[PDB]
Amino acid sequence: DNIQGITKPAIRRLARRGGVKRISGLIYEETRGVLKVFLENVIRDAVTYTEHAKRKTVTAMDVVYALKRQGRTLYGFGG
Amino acid sequence: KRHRKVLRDNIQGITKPAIRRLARRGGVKRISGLIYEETRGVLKVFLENVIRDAVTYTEHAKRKTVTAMDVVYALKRQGRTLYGFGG
Amino acid sequence: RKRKRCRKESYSIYIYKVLKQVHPDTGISSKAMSIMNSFVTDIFERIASEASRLAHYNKRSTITSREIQTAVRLLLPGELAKHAVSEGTKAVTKYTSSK
Amino acid sequence: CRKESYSIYIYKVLKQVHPDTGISSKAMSIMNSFVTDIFERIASEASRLAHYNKRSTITSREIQTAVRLLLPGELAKHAVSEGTKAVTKYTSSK
Amino acid sequence: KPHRYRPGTVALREIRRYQKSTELLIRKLPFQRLVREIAQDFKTDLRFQSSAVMALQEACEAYLVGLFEDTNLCAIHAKRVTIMPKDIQLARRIRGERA
Amino acid sequence: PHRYRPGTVALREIRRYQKSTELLIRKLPFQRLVREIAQDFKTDLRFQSSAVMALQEACEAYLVGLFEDTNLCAIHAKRVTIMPKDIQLARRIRGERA
Amino acid sequence: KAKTRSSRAGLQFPVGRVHRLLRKGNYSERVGAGAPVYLAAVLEYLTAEILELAGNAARDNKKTRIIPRHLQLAIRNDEELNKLLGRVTIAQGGVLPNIQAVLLPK
Amino acid sequence: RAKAKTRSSRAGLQFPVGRVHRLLRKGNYSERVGAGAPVYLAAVLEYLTAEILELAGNAARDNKKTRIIPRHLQLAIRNDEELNKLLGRVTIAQGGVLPNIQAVLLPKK
DNA sequence: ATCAATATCCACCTGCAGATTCTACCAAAAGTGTATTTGGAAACTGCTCCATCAAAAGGCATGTTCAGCTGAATTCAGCTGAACATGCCTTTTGATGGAGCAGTTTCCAAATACACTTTTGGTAGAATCTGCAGGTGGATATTGAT
DNA sequence: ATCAATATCCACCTGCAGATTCTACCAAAAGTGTATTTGGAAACTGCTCCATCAAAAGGCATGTTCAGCTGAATTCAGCTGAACATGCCTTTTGATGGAGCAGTTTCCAAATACACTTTTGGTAGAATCTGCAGGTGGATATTGAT
Ligand SMILES: [Cl-]
Ligand SMILES: [Cl-]
Ligand SMILES: [Cl-]
Ligand SMILES: [Cl-]
Ligand SMILES: [Cl-]
Ligand SMILES: [Mn+2]
Ligand SMILES: [Mn+2]
Ligand SMILES: [Mn+2]
Ligand SMILES: [Mn+2]
Ligand SMILES: [Mn+2]
Ligand SMILES: [Mn+2]
Ligand SMILES: [Mn+2]
Ligand SMILES: [Mn+2]
Ligand SMILES: [Mn+2]
Ligand SMILES: [Mn+2]
Ligand SMILES: [Mn+2]
Ligand SMILES: [Mn+2]
Ligand SMILES: [Mn+2]
Ligand SMILES: [Mn+2]
Ligand SMILES: [Mn+2]
Ligand SMILES: [Mn+2]
Ligand SMILES: [Mn+2]
Ligand SMILES: [Mn+2]
Ligand SMILES: [Mn+2]
Structure with a gap:
């Protein structure tokens, strides 16, 4: 599965940038679910375009x- | 030529029991004593932002x-978005 | 003395028609109708807008049934969009058969 | 397939405010997206204003109201100023 | 002999009462008064269509009833049953509002 | 053997990654990921590199702010450790859920 | 010999008016002939799906006449309508009955 | 005949009054565009670009950089009360976050 | 496990306010016919984008240790909820005066419409420059021990 | 807080590749000049719809007392998650080759835009219909105390 390619040390960096000091173990599978959901909504619309x-x-x-x-809204690739 | 009474301090007209009714619809069982002034603060800000634009229109x-x-x-x-007034 | 007159337009007569089709015995209060009227106007704008974007995005001067359809896919949750895309296609083919 | 950006205009404005400083290409495209973004926000609101009042024309008056609706208080105030400054100087030239 | 409901019992009855209903919950003259005060600070000698104050009241009450749901989740997340300002604050910031 | 107290590397790591602006998910597993998902929608779709780079930028920002939000929720419950229930609450209040 | 386009498409919704509204709202310089039809259909389908559930909600509360509470119940209990109208307020709608379990006695 | 002078020049703007006029036309925002609308708009656009680059530039000099990069844009916008709200729901590619550590997480001593 | 005290449900009635049905003008679709666009259907590029291949490198998965955090259990002070008297002020309803929507007419200041004529923004190699990868060398922070 | 001892960061320098800035052109926008439609500001003006005022009722906001129970604080153990070193492996990065395309250009059939002239669907009051708001009273549940 490719969602598992989004690894624990990567998810932990995002949390570090997001300012989290301590991270529970159940977080990484939770995070992947949410990232999964995000990517779908955005891509579904993008392919439809x-x-x-x-x-x-x-x-x-x-x-x-x-x-x-x-x-x-995302800046830097057209507006 | 004639005037109305000056409108001032009317946020205090939003009474405590009303603030308590709204929280009940919102599912609150227990309310701190400081909640009531906070709500008034939040309501006022809301109404200003909304009315400002309404008036600008x-x-x-x-x-x-x-x-x-x-x-x-x-x-x-x-x-x-509000439905039911020209929505 | 002389007199002046006005005129308003809503979706009320249509909303009532569709109401009777699904619940023949049921009626609707004014506030409820007014809410329904608000809903059509809203959805109408969301679709028209997204359609307008799609057209402008592809350097097109024309809004066709197709821009409407894609717009519908973007704004409706699947299975509301699946049904809506269905009903709308039914209407365009029927409209094209009798000219 | 010619393109178009606000780059040279942003570069021009950049050099007026900091002559010595430059701008990376990625930073420039971010600015290009900014100008495009706000442009749409203001135009839309102006389109909305016109249609609400059964009007066919977007005028400076529409932009001005739109600018009021969209910009934070002290920023609306300076923008509204700058824009009037620009229309007046434009009428000056006859 | 005298009868007393344990604290919380009347609250739960009220939550049920008011969730079952759709009446406005702020009293109508004081709200109107508040609105005219605010509006008159932006522009003087304004008048209001009745439907406009009622629109403003509906919008406000809807806003607060919903903020209170979000505030209530925040108190609970902190293992409490009592809403306090920090719950509203947390809620307003996550939502994207401020001060 | 020298050991930093638990939490000291973390406050150091936070500083590193807030001071910086690089992408934090590594690019290939991600590009790989985006491509799987897309073919749940169509096949022989193709991607501008800038398009995948755009999606990645969109993701990390989303997750970083959610992580800011989750963090406030955790601190609110008098904890220092974020948990799934914190991510749950933050997404609910945002309007992405329930 | 006149034949309304709504009739031709088998719709209750005014294909004609919907055509007029796309034009005088300036969404594009020109409008295709199929666009108001498809649009009028979707509008009609959505008011149908909503009124369906709101009518069901009036009967379950022994009412003949649909009121805004029934619109609100129908909408907030239907997963997809609730998403479509996630940022919409229904005047006089109320909220759905919900008490966090943490708050009940037992 | 006579000698041409761009509407931008007539208004004292760097931003393209002509181009902003065309875009208002070709965006379908209205049947008509007044002559004052693009002028006003282009000015407003220029002004906001100035305010951002001013602050974004001040930040580049504080990192000893000649070139403004997205980080400085991100620094400038997110640190200014009003620009930050205007761009409150905007993601800046390669911007990063503002350094901020919730105080509870710092050591007691 | 019972009882007294409350509150909530839930169905019955009925004129009346609010919803339906109905009428008749008329604004706006519809039908026609002429005048314009336009979005293709075929035919051609250059160019991005996949598809591989294979070095070298950090970066990641592992497993062990242990610090210290989260959650549980207890304690207690004080705050908030329930209950009730009291009386203020909202709610209704109603009449009246009057501002100011909104309906109309008439007419220029202002926009649109071609036709030409410069002038500029965009584009693509060539010609300078700023971060940047790295290297220190030194300070700055941190940990465990007195 | 000092002391010493690893460990990690972070400024002072510095040549060079990858970008930015600079030169030299041109189609395509932008500007001009002239001729005309035309949207919408003005000037009324009929007339809804709003702003007050007020009387009279009786609904609720208030203020007060008091104790149940909640929130805040402490203490503590077990168990989870951080840190770390080691070692394997996935990811970067660096060209290459060729196809599958998006992007253009140009040509006409087909589609849409208009302007009038009917013709009908939709709307505004007017005239009927009628749920159900509001006011009840008996049952059925619920709560809290012996
Ligand atoms: Cl989302
Ligand atoms: Cl070395
Ligand atoms: Cl000692
Ligand atoms: Cl002409
Ligand atoms: Cl407790
Ligand atoms: Mn049916
Ligand atoms: Mn009692
Ligand atoms: Mn103008
Ligand atoms: Mn009557
Ligand atoms: Mn090697
Ligand atoms: Mn009193
Ligand atoms: Mn040039
Ligand atoms: Mn040039
Ligand atoms: Mn360096
Ligand atoms: Mn370096
Ligand atoms: Mn020792
Ligand atoms: Mn080079
Ligand atoms: Mn003529
Ligand atoms: Mn006219
Ligand atoms: Mn007493
Ligand atoms: Mn006590
Ligand atoms: Mn231990
Ligand atoms: Mn008829
Ligand atoms: Mn009743």
Whole structure:
């Protein structure tokens, strides 16, 4: 499974940047579930932008538009 | 030519038992004594943000009356959509 | 003396029609109708807007049934979108058969 | 397939405020996204304003109200100022 | 002899009472008074459509009833039954509001 | 043998990664991940490298702020250790759940 | 010989008006002929799905007439409508009955 | 005949008054755009760019950098009460977070 | 396990307010016919993007130790909830005066519409420069022991 | 707090590759100049809809007393999660080759835009219909004390 590729030391760095000092063991599987969910919502919308344009490549703008729909605006790849 | 009574301090009109009724609908069983002033603080901020925009919509339309639609448009900007008044 | 008159437009007559189709015996209060009217106008804007974006995104001057459909896929939860996409396609083919 | 950014205009504004400082390419694209972003926020609100009042035209008056609705208090105030400064100086030239 | 409900019992009855209902919970003249005071600080000599104060009241009460759900979860997360300002504060910040 | 007290490396690690701005999930398992998920939607989809880089930026920020939020919830319950129930509460209050 | 487009598409919703509204709202320079039809259908399907559940909610509370409480119950108890309307307030709707278990005696 | 002078120049702006006019037109925001609208808008846009780059630049000099990088943008925006709210739901690629350690987590001594 | 005290449910009635049905003008679809776009269907590129391959490198999985954190159990002071008298002030309802929506008309200041004519933003090699990978060498923090 | 002892960070320097800034062009926007439609500010003006005021009722906010139970504090053990060293392995990174595409250009059938002229669906009051708000009283549950 590829979700398990998102490893414990990576999830712990994110937590360190997010300012967490101590981390419970059940967190990493919890985190993967949430990351999983996030990626789906965003990609579902992005591919839907792709299919509409009759393209086969997902563009940066496709992800930017999806992220805007989801209320999470991203700067630096088009707006 | 005539005047109204000065409107001042009306946030205290939002009484404690009303704040207690709202929390009950919100599922609160027990309430700290300091809650009531906090709520008033939060409500006031809410109302200002919402009304400011409502009035801005009024100033723009060159009106003197605030309409339900002004308030519904304000509420939409602010991300809290209201159904049932022109919604 | 002379007199002046006005006119408003809502989805009320349609909402009532659809109400009678599903619950023939049931009625609807004004506040309830007004809420329903608010709902149509809302969904109408969300779809029209997203459709407008899709068109502008692909350097297109025209909103077609297809922009509407994609928009619908983006705004509705699956199985509300699955049914909606279905009902709408039914309407366009039916509309195209009798010209 | 020609593109378009606000880069040269941002670079121009960058050099007016800090002559000595430059901007990485990634930073520039972030700014380009910012300008594009706010532009849409203001235009939309202006479009909304016009339609609400059964109006066909977006005027500076619409931008100004839109700017009021979208910008935080001290930022609305300076922006509203700067924009009027820009329209007046534009009318000056006859 | 005199009868007394243990503390919490009347609270639970009230929670049930008011969740079953849909009436406005702030009294209507003091709320109106509050709104006219605030609105008059932005612009003077305004008037209000009735539906506009009622819209504002519905919107407010909805906001607070819901903040209280979120506040209530926060007290509980901290192994308490009593809501306090830090619960509202925590809730308002996670939500994305402030001060 | 020298040993730092538990918590001392952590406060050091927090400082490192807040002071910095690099991506924190390593790029290939992630790129790999994004590609699996997408084909739950279509096949022979293709990705601009910048598109996967965009998704990765979107993810880490999301998770980092959720982690800020989870952390406040943990401290609120007078703990220093975040747990699933903290992530649960933060996502509920945000509106992503229940 | 006149034949309303709503009739042609088998819809209650006014395909004609929905056409007018797409135009005078400026979403694009031109509007395709199928767009208001598809849209009017989706509007009609969604008001149908909601009124269905709200009617069910009125009958279970022995009422003939739908009131805003029934809209609110129908909406907040349906997983997908609740998502669609997650940021919507229904005037006079109330909340769903819910008491955290931690709060009950026993 | 006569001698051309760009609307940006007439308004004393660096930002493209002409381009902002075209974009308002081709975005379908209204049937018509007044001549004052793009001027006003372009000014407003320029001003916000100035305010950000001002503060983002001050931060680059404090890291001894000639070049503004996203970190300085992120520093500038998230440290200014108002810019931070305007951009409250915006992610800045390669921005990082503001250094902040919740005090409870620091040692007692 | 019973009892007294409460509160909540839940069905019965009925004029009346609020919802339905109905009427008749008329605004706005619909039908026609002419005038414009436009989004394709085929034909062509250059260019990103996959698909592999294989070094070398940090970075990750492991397992053991032990610090110290989370949660449990107890204790207690004081705060908040329940209950009741009292009386203020909201709620209703109603009449009236009057501002100011909203409906209309008429007319310019202002926008749109071509036709041309510069002028600029974008683009692509060539020509300078700033971080950057690294290296210290030194300070700065930290831990376990007196 | 001092002392000593690892361990880790972090400023002072420094040549060089990967980027930024600089040069030299051009199609495509932007600007001008002239000729015309036209949206919407103004000036009324009818008339809803709002702002007060007030009387009279009786619903609730208030203030007070008091004890149940909650929150805060302490103490403590067991068990989880941090830190660390070791060692294997996944990930980076660095070109290469070739196909599967998005991006253009250009051509016409097909689709959409308009303007009038009917023709009908939708709306506003008016005239009927009618749930059910509100006011009850008996049962059925619930709570808390002997
Ligand atoms: Cl989400
Ligand atoms: Cl070395
Ligand atoms: Cl000693
Ligand atoms: Cl002409
Ligand atoms: Cl306790
Ligand atoms: Mn049915
Ligand atoms: Mn009693
Ligand atoms: Mn203008
Ligand atoms: Mn009547
Ligand atoms: Mn080797
Ligand atoms: Mn009193
Ligand atoms: Mn040039
Ligand atoms: Mn140039
Ligand atoms: Mn360096
Ligand atoms: Mn280095
Ligand atoms: Mn010793
Ligand atoms: Mn080089
Ligand atoms: Mn003419
Ligand atoms: Mn006119
Ligand atoms: Mn007493
Ligand atoms: Mn006691
Ligand atoms: Mn121990
Ligand atoms: Mn008819
Ligand atoms: Mn009743």
